[PDB]
Every structure is written in structure tokens, then in C-alpha cells.
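Duplicate of #3305? Posting structure anyway:
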């Protein structure tokens, strides 16, 4: 249970995702690649772009093969598109292996790359079902497992930033670990609790109960998972379905009511500040998500602090103060357990056993009074079904699955 070579192999800027160094081609071309458990394509910049210092140069790789097939991926924000191919891929601070993987060479994009994020591509770690153009394009991790003896599991320790902050002109640097093929016991303390992967597409899970400062939201538990709940390293925020979001904000507002913040703050569109080191953490409540256990009628809770859901942003004009962004936001596409959740925990994506593990992270930000927690079991006599069944479209139904 020791993977020293892979510890601290993640970097990034606060709110701009976590990336790992990868190489593509022969000889190896190094790129920084966003670690994304919310998608399933390995897609890299492969042409000049204003926000790229470098890109994958297929012509420089003796081992590159063109698959003679394009790929077009639109999404809420924008789109990326390009050409499918294969090449040799490695993770220098990962397992000592080289695999031939599918690579989408991004030739055109809109609102995909971010000025200053320092990443040039994305590593989709989710399952084939949500790969583009379709589920026949083998995702990277599937290729890695099939071609090597690497166990079918990876784990993520995402470590958040906190004041004092080093720089005023740039966003705070973040670090973390992606342990490929194993669990590193130095990265967590206490018990490691597992929730089932409901279905292998996204890393979909089931939330059975939500509490804000020990107070049950008392909603039909299907609301918590409408229309899905997923664990997504490629989302910064904790994102909650509309109804759940409104209930949560109401509760957090009430607990923090000694402070009257502008509406902009609760919408995540405006910072709030206190004098250096005087942030009244104790007025903000803890948030507990109870996740379905491996055992029928059991659940466990993961509990996060305001240190997780209030993101530090050092203002150039207000460098004397500690300023924060509210990082819980509304969703119309289900619960997203993003960096806000993951930064409290060491998270084990146990694909082999169709389960996700949570333990208290050795690097989570806390204070002397409260800690992020993973606690269980909680037993519920005749526990309800909290899963939502997404209405089946004719187009989806018409697909064959040979
Ligand atoms: C929600 N989500 C996405 O929209 C997506 C979809 C896709 C097509 C792979 O493209 C991107 C590109 C950048 C980011 C991005 C940009 C800035 C910060 C962070 C983070 N954390 C992530 C996220 C994504 N992947 C996920 N999981
Ligand atoms: Ni058929």
C-alpha cells in the first residue's frame, strides 16, 4: 500500500482543474492533461491555439497511426473537435508502462482551453458508454488495464488551497495525487467506506440523505439524485439539483445569518472578504451527504466543511483580506460531487469491484474545531429506492449494442 512515485503527481490552478503530466508519441512529447472522471475521451490539443504553448505534433511521432475518422464534441459551454488516431502513451509519474491508446487530436475548439490553466488536453477516466463518437472508442484506462497488468483501479487525492496565499497576481497553485492501480495508505486516515457504482457510464452513485449542520433536509431522496449523482474530478463545485440547491442555500443562509452577503455571493458571482485570518468559519455549517452502502439498508456519510465549499481567491485590490467564492451551485443535470467534495477525501475509483471509496484525506483543509469526516454505518430499516430512472428517448432506445 505504498506508491511513492505517484504521490504529488497532480498540479493545477484553483478552480481550473487538476492535471497530470503525460507523454504521447515516439519519442515522448510531454503534455499536461486534465484528470476528468466526468468524461471518457483522451483528447489533446494538436494544432496552434492562443492559450496553448505547445501541442501534440502527430508528424513528429513515428508510432502515430491515423484512424481516418473525425470526432465532434459539443457541450453546454462550447465544443472540441478533431481527428481520431492511436499512439503510444505513458504517465511519467505513474506506472512504469507504455500503452497504445486512442487519442483525439483536437484541431478546432471553442471555449475548451482556458488561458493560464496550463493544461493542453483531457484524460476522460469514465466509462465507454459516454465516449465519443460512440462506445466503441476504447477509453484510455480500459486500454491501460487490457494491455498491462495494472489493476483495474485508480485513486485521487485532490488537495485544496488555503490562506495565507503566496501570490496576488495569479490564482493559487493546487496539488494532488493520482495513484494508478492502487491505494496509498499515507494519503488517508481512518476508515475507507465504499458506495456502489450504480451504473458504469459516469461514476454514478446514490445519495440517500442530506444534512446541513446536523439538520435533515427531509426531501424525497430521489430529489438528491435527480436525474443522477456523479463523482466528477472535472467539475470544481458541489453542484446540486435546483430543489436541493434552494433548500441547501436556505439552510446555509440561516446558519450564517449574522453576516448579510449580497445575492451575488450565493450565486457564485461575487467574493466576500474578512480581514486576514479572521474568517468566522464557525458561522458556516457542515454539509453531510449520506451515500448508499455496500450492504442493503446501510449508508455512510461524508461530511465537508466551509473550508471546502468556500474557495479562497486572493484579490489584487483586496490583498490585505481573505476573500472567498461560494462553490455550491445549481444543476439541471443532477448532483455533481466535484472538487468541493473530493478535496475533503481520498477517493478510490474501484472499477474492478464496481464501487467508490471515501476516506478522510490526509491533506484536507480544516481547523481545530471541525474536520471533514467519513462515518458509518447508518442503518435504515426498509431503506427506500433513491435512484432516478432517466426517461428513455426513442433515439437512445433505437441503438443496438452488439
Ligand atoms: C463538467 N465537465 C465538463 O464540462 C468537461 C467536458 C469536456 C468535453 C471533457 O470538456 C471540458 C473542458 C474543461 C473542463 C473544465 C474547465 C475548468 C475547470 C474544470 C474543473 N474542475 C474543468 C471540463 C470539461 N468535463 C467535465 N467533467
Ligand atoms: Ni443490430
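Output from current build:
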Amino acid at each position: 500500500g505504498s506508491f511513492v512515485e505517484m504521490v504529488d503527481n497532480l498540479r493545477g490552478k484553483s478552480g481550473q482543474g487538476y492535471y497530470v503530466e503525460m507523454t504521447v508519441g515516439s519519442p515522448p512529447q510531454t503534455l499536461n492533461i486534465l484528470v476528468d472522471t466526468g468524461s471518457s475521451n483522451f483528447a489533446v490539443g494538436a494544432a496552434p491555439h492562443p492559450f496553448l504553448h505547445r501541442y501534440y505534433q502527430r508528424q513528429l511521432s513515428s508510432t502515430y497511426r491515423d484512424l481516418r475518422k473525425g470526432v465532434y464534441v459539443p457541450y453546454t459551454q462550447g465544443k472540441w473537435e478533431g481527428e481520431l488516431g492511436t499512439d503510444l502513451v505513458s504517465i511519467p509519474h505513474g506506472p512504469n508502462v507504455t500503452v497504445r491508446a486512442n487519442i483525439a487530436a483536437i484541431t478546432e475548439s471553442d471555449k475548451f482551453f482556458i488561458n493560464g490553466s496550463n493544461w493542453e488536453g483531457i484524460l476522460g477516466l469514465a466509462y465507454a458508454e459516454i465516449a465519443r463518437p460512440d462506445d466503441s472508442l476504447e477509453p484510455f484506462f480500459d486500454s491501460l488495464v487490457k494491455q498491462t497488468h495494472v489493476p483495474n483501479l485508480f485513486s485521487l487525492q485532490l488537495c485544496g488551497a488555503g490562506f495565507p496565499l503566496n501570490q496576488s497576481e495569479v490564482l493559487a497553485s493546487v496539488g494532488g495525487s493520482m495513484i494508478i492501480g492502487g491505494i496509498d495508505h499515507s494519503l488517508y486516515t481512518g476508515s475507507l467506506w465504499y458506495t456502489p457504482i450504480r451504473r458504469e457510464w459516469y461514476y454514478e452513485v446514490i445519495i440517500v440523505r442530506v444534512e446541513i449542520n446536523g439538520q435533515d433536509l427531509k426531501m424525497d431522496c430521489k430529489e438528491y439524485n435527480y436525474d443522477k449523482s456523479i463523482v466528477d474530478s472535472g467539475t470544481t463545485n458541489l453542484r446540486l439539483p435546483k430543489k436541493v440547491f434552494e433548500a441547501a442555500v436556505k439552510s446555509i443562509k440561516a446558519a450564517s445569518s449574522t453576516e448579510k452577503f449580497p445575492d451575488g455571493f450565493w450565486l457564485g458571482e461575487q467574493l466576500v472578504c474578512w480581514q486576514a485570518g479572521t474568517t468566522p468559519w464557525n458561522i458556516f455549517p457542515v454539509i453531510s451527504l449520506y451515500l448508499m452502502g455496500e450492504v442493503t439498508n446501510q449508508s455512510f456519510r461524508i461530511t465537508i466543511l466551509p473550508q471546502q465549499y468556500l474557495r479562497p481567491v486572493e484579490d489584487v485590490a483586496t490583498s490585505q483580506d481573505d476573500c472567498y467564492k461560494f462553490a455550491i451551485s445549481q444543476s439541471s443535470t443532477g448532483t455533481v460531487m466535484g472538487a468541493v467534495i473530493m478535496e475533503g477525501f481520498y477517493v478510490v475509483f474501484d472499477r474492478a469491484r464496481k464501487r467508490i471509496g471515501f476516506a478522510v484525506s490526509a491533506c484536507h483543509v480544516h481547523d481545530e474545531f471541525r474536520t471533514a469526516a467519513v462515518e458509518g454505518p447508518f442503518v435504515t430499516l426498509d431503506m427506500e429506492d433513491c435512484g432516478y430512472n432517466i426517461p428513455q428517448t426513442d433515439e437512445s432506445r433505437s441503438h443496438h449494442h452488439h
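Confirmed duplicate; merging threads. The pocket of nickel (II) ion (ligand 2) is lined by residues 400, 402 (CB under 6 Å). The longest strand covers residues 79-90.
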